[PDB]
Design a protein around this ligand. Structure first.
Ligand code: MN
Ligand code: MN
Lengths: 302, 373, 566
């Protein structure tokens, strides 16, 4: 909110747009400011009608630019992400830094949720701790980012008609008040409502089922319909599931899975999509292909 | 068919069959072309395989050259460009294998060659003038093929060739050493490292007790540098087995092996660090008490950092060393100078960890250390 | 400690500078030579540091004292430090005097080439060229003998190094010895059992043919070049195809017509997709660099029938490579040949199913525009471009938009207003923001090319009617268009036609459009008259400063500050 601080934040955003990382002290200051900003949102986030919804990015920074080119620049176009910024990518640090900087700089225009991969255990199992070690020489920036990930809001609510979340519903959750009652200022547990909100998936089995991934549950069309009718919702936007077309409609068009990382892991070769909500809350899907690539040390060296 | 034919032109019918199947067909451009010609040649190859494993006294001096020539024309080729993309952002363990299109024929050729090598009447003295250093080099060149079944068949064939041919042993070892040198220092991309290491381990199992300088230098400068490659997770079990095999063959190499492992310790690869810890424990279960006292200082200096690392997987892997009774018992034998190296590391992370299982393991290890002395 | 030792080795330069010139030779250098043997990190840092010690050691007359440690440091197994040590040795060898070169450096390379392990031999393989042309006749001859020994060595790794450095070594040897010593070893390397050495011999073939007279090229290099082109290794064939242009430039204009044209035809007609793509990459340059007396005839008789088949190749990379240069030979063939033969190929590649192929084939449309008449272009390729202007791939649409201003300027206003204005206006309401901004930039180029009156009469109402779009993306699109057009439309048009729209739309419900209005007013502010700025612009800005959003308030305050309405 202060003049020179905002100018420095704009400089940081411009530098990040060139796929350039920030210094450790800069990351520390940005993480502290982001923690102060995010400490004052509830578990559910109120988002206005005109906003663009994007799914998992997973550290593909050039792909995120391509997404920005497709959907408009960050300040001009309202955006809403539902997690999974750092894993399975070669620029996870840059991706999370850019997204968090946008959240700090444009808090009324950028709304970033919490995905299952923004947790200490998963980010240690997969390649973000190693990525941070390679890019910084120590494990301080990783600690800052993991601590910041705790304060991220679990879900978001746009115009009180659309429910935005990463994983899906839980057997122990049935009402937005119950979602509000949860405590999110902690590492995600191995089980419970908070873990279930970020790890669940939809299927065509009906009722609550065991998740093959190892955490969360699987909810059916009946569960989605009763949740929608109880909470007065017409659409539940979700992520965390890979889809070839980029977007997928399930459970009689009650939930939608949006994936914004085409050519997943640079191996899948899929397409992506984003959800644009206009003034009258009419959804539109834009599909885009991965950005073209131009410009084509021992592990014990330290 | 051979079985219905009379017995006095058998060799000629067999040689005609080996002259057949030497023609190469196309499976990539057209997969439904010359179906009859493919089926008859496949039937001929299967007939050869069934015959050479059942009939006796049927291998003559005139069959070896036709066999090696047919194998050469059918298999000795230049490998196609790799379909898997190469780069720093691609995980070496995620490369989907590219199956060979001509497998329905290559598998039969491999099976025929394996049975011919394993035939009871196979004569190495006669066969050595056809299978030569050029044949061995051509066979070793095919180990980079992306087909796992082709790699397995090549591994079995190479093992049989080494076992039966005494004069090609040094040449085979030198060629494998050259391939490993190239993979380590120039290319860092090879699909047959695991099979080559399996062959080399089976080779190690038969080394003489007075270990030779050649084998010692091979261990010091080939197996040890193999730990520094980015794709170490693909072939780590085989490399660990080879290192343990050398350790059990000669216990005087434990200090060089451990000091090399600590030298190549990864610092930006948590799975590689976990594999290093696993291999270090495997080496340590067979270390001698006298030799342990000579490398324990650097060993525990590295183990302190392994215990103190924020990564939970490596922390628990380092903490699991306490469940092994040998390491703990020999720690007590060197407690006077083991205590101050490791005590600060265990004490400083008593409660400073994001994981509670790590807290429990650290408390258990600390209580075990306290009860020691 | 590893890090402290690394920092100390990096500051070894400062330490030696503080040390005296003679004592840094008496104590420091022997200490590095004897005591230090440590991790690869510090060894590599020492190798880097030792590369600039020429002036610090006492000048060129005593640089030979850096040979002992550099020799021990060039045999290290790791490649990253061995290479640094070898470049250090090359750099040091330049300052060596001819008198002591044969007394300290030649013995050093002699010892390194006779090393037991392959690392020392590989390191020594790269030191021949930097010390060859400055030594005496006998020392040269023995250097040639040891280079031949290295080339005929048992280990394929040092054989690879020799094949790599053969051309650089031959660049400094006299013609008679090149004809008699370099050629046989190059031929032997070209027939090695390893394709990884055969391809390097192929690469060195270009440099070997560079310095030879044309008379004996056919009898010395050419059979080797042919046997390399017809090699059984796709890698060797690919390297030949890649270096085909350099081979043609080296060989000389004559032998090319005799032999390279069939070689090029065979390479492009190869069962390997990678080799086909590599050969197609040079399909323009090879035709361009042909002999002038029969360039057109040779191309028309040999290359065009081949690229007619390549056009419809199954693989996509070869098609993209061919399309990237297919118009490269249109001026060479001429107008009649282009319209007769290349135009169907251009249409087929424009209608191709590969987005990369379409992008590449479109990207060079000006080259064919400068050859054939604009009437012919509009008669033939205009239906293709208007059909592709609505392509599913926004990259192709962006390329067409970028090409559009030149095509419109060549076609004329009467043609444009009748058959392209609809497309240009429809580009502004596209679903892709990049396409929308490209359309705005193309619209600015169009107004620059066509004048202010044409815009005011044709396109200003078209972009002004867009401000009523219910989608706020398209609403901001009007602001972007006004921003783009204000600097060209002139003050009168700007203050009479697009001030009212911005002023009225300043009260949009959406905060995004609300602050974009402030940004547009800030940008187009200088173009406006001062009376308008104080009388109609200030009240709306001060109204916007009282808005509830923080971003809107900030942008309004910034606009007030820069525009000097505070
Ligand atoms: Mn997820
Ligand atoms: Mn995900």
């Amino acid at each position: 909110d202060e003049k020179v601080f905002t100018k420095e934040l704009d400089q940081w955003i411009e530098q990040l747009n060139e796929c350039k990382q920030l210094s450790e002290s800069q990351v520390k200051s940005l993480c502290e400011k982001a923690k102060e900003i995010l400490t004052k949102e509830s578990n559910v986030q109120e988002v206005r009608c005109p906003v663009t919804v994007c799914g998992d990015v997973h550290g593909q920074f050039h792909d995120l630019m391509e997404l920005f080119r497709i959907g408009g620049k960050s300040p001009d176009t309202n955006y809403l992400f539902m997690g999974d910024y750092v894993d399975r990518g070669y620029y996870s640090v840059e991706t999370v830094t850019l997204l968090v900087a946008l959240k700090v700089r444009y808090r009324e225009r950028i709304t970033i949720l919490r995905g299952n991969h923004e947790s200490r255990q998963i980010t240690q199992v997969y390649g973000f701790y190693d990525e941070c070690l390679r890019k910084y020489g120590n494990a301080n920036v990783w600690k800052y980012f993991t601590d910041l990930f705790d304060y991220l809001p679990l879900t978001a609510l746009v115009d009180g008609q659309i429910f935005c979340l990463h994983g899906g519903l839980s057997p122990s959750i049935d009402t937005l008040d119950h979602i509000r009652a949860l405590d999110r200022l902690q590492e995600v547990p191995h089980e419970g409502p908070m873990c279930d909100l970020l790890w669940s998936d939809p299927d065509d089995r009906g009722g609550w089922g065991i998740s093959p991934r190892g955490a969360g549950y699987t909810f059916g069309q009946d569960i989605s319909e009763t949740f929608n009718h109880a909470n007065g919702l017409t659409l539940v936007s979700r992520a965390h599931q890979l889809v070839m077309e980029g977007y997928n409609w399930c459970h009689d068009r009650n939930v939608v899975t949006i994936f914004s990382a085409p050519n997943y892991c640079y191996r899948c070769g899929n397409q992506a999509a984003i959800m644009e909500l206009d003034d009258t809350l009419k959804y539109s899907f834009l599909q885009f292909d991965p950005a073209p690539r131009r410009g084509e040390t021992p592990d014990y060296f330290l | 068919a051979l079985k219905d034919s009379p017995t006095q032109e058998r060799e000629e019918l067999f040689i005609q069959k080996l002259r057949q199947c030497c023609v190469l067909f196309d499976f990539v451009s057209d997969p439904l072309s010359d179906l009859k010609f493919k089926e008859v040649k496949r039937a001929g190859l299967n007939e050869m395989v069934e015959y050479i494993t059942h009939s006796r006294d049927v291998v003559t001096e005139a069959i070896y050259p036709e066999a090696v020539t047919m194998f050469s024309v059918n298999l000795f080729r230049t490998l196609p460009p790799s379909s898997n993309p190469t780069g720093a952002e691609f995980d070496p363990k995620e490369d989907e294998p590219t199956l060979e299109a001509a497998w329905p024929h290559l598998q039969l050729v491999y099976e025929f060659f394996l049975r011919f090598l394993e035939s009871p009447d196979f004569q190495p003295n006669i066969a050595k003038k056809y299978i030569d250093q050029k044949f061995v080099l051509a066979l070793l060149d095919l180990f980079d093929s992306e087909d796992p079944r082709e790699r397995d068949f090549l591994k079995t064939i190479l093992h049989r060739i080494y076992g039966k041919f005494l004069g090609l042993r040094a040449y085979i070892r030198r060629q494998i050493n050259h391939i490993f040198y190239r993979f380590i220092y120039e290319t860092e991309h090879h699909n047959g490292i695991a099979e080559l290491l399996e062959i080399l381990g089976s080779i190690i199992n038969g080394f003489a007790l007075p270990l030779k300088e050649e084998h010692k230098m091979f261990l010091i400068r080939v197996l040890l540098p193999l730990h520094k490659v980015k794709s170490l997770s693909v072939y780590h079990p085989q490399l660990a087995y080879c290192v343990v095999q050398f350790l059990e063959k000669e216990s005087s190499l434990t200090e060089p092996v451990i000091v090399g492992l600590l030298k190549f310790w990864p610092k930006t690869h948590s799975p590689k660090e976990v594999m290093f810890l696993n291999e270090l424990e495997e080496i340590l279960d067979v270390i001698e008490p006298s030799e342990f006292s000579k490398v324990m200082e650097p060993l525990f200096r590295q183990l302190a950092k392994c215990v103190s690392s924020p990564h939970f997987q490596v922390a628990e892997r380092a903490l699991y060393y306490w469940n092994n009774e040998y390491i703990m018992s020999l720690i007590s034998d060197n407690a006077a100078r083991v205590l101050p190296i490791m005590f600060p590391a265990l004490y400083r992370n008593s409660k400073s960890h994001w994981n509670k299982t790590i807290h429990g393991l650290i408390y258990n290890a600390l209580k075990l250390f306290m009860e020691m002395n | 400690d590893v890090q402290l030792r690394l920092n100390s080795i990096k500051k070894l330069s400062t330490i030696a500078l503080a040390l005296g010139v003679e004592r840094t030779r008496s104590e420091l250098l022997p200490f590095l030579t004897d005591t230090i043997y440590d991790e690869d990190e510090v060894l590599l840092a020492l190798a880097e540091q030792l590369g600039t010690f020429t002036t610090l050691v006492g000048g060129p007359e005593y640089v030979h004292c850096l040979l002992p440690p550099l020799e021990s440091l060039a045999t290290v197994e790791e490649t990253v430090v061995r290479d640094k040590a070898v470049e250090s040795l090359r750099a040091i060898s330049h300052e060596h005097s001819p008198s002591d070169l044969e007394a300290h450096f030649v013995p050093l390379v002699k010892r390194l080439a006779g090393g037991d392990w392959f690392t020392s031999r590989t390191s020594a393989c790269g030191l021949f060229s930097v010390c060859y042309p400055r030594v005496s006749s006998a020392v040269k001859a023995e250097l040639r003998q040891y280079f031949r020994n290295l080339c005929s060595d048992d280990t394929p790794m040092v054989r690879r190094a020799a094949a790599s450095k053969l051309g650089e070594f031959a660049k400094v040897l006299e013609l008679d010895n090149v004809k008699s010593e370099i050629i046989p070893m190059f031929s032997n390397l070209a027939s090695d059992e390893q394709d990884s050495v055969r391809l390097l011999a192929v690469e060195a073939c270009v440099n070997i043919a560079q310095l030879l007279p044309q008379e004996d090229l056919e009898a010395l290099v050419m059979p080797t070049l042919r046997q390399a082109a017809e090699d059984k290794s796709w890698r060797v064939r690919y390297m030949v195809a890649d270096k085909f242009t350099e081979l043609q430039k080296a060989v000389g204009p004559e032998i090319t017509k005799t032999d390279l044209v069939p070689a090029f035809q065979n390479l492009m007609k190869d069962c390997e997709a990678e080799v086909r793509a590599a050969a197609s990459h040079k399909v323009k340059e090879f035709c361009e660099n042909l002999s002038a007396d029969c360039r057109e005839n040779v191309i028309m008789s040999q290359i065009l029938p081949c690229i007619k088949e390549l056009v419809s190749d199954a693989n996509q990379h070869v098609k993209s490579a061919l399309a990237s240069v297919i118009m490269g030979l249109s001026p060479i063939l001429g107008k009649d040949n282009t319209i007769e033969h290349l135009l169907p190929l251009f249409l087929a590649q424009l209608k191709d199913e590969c987005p990369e192929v379409r992008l590449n084939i479109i990207s060079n449309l000006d080259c064919v525009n400068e050859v054939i008449g604009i009437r012919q272009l509009s008669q033939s390729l205009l239906p293709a471009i208007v059909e592709l202007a609505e392509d599913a791939k926004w990259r192709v649409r962006l390329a067409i938009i970028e090409y559009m201003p030149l095509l419109a300027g060549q076609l004329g206003v009467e043609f444009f207003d009748e058959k392209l204005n609809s497309l240009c206006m429809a580009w502004l309401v596209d679903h892709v923001y990049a396409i929308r901004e490209a359309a705005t930039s193309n619209l600015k180029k169009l107004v620059e090319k066509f004048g202010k009156e044409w815009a005011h009469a044709t396109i200003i109402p078209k972009v002004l009617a867009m401000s009523g779009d219910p989608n706020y993306l398209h609403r901001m699109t009007t602001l972007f268009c006004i921003n783009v057009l204000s600097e060209v439309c002139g003050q009168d048009i700007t203050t009479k036609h697009m001030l009212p729209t911005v002023l009225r739309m300043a009260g949009d419900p959406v905060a995004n459009v609300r602050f974009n209005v402030a940004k547009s007013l800030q940008k187009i502010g200088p173009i406006l008259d001062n009376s308008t700025l104080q009388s109609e612009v200030k009240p709306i800005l001060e109204k916007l400063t009282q808005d509830q959003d923080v971003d809107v308030k900030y942008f309004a305050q910034e606009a007030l500050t820069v525009l000097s309405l505070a």
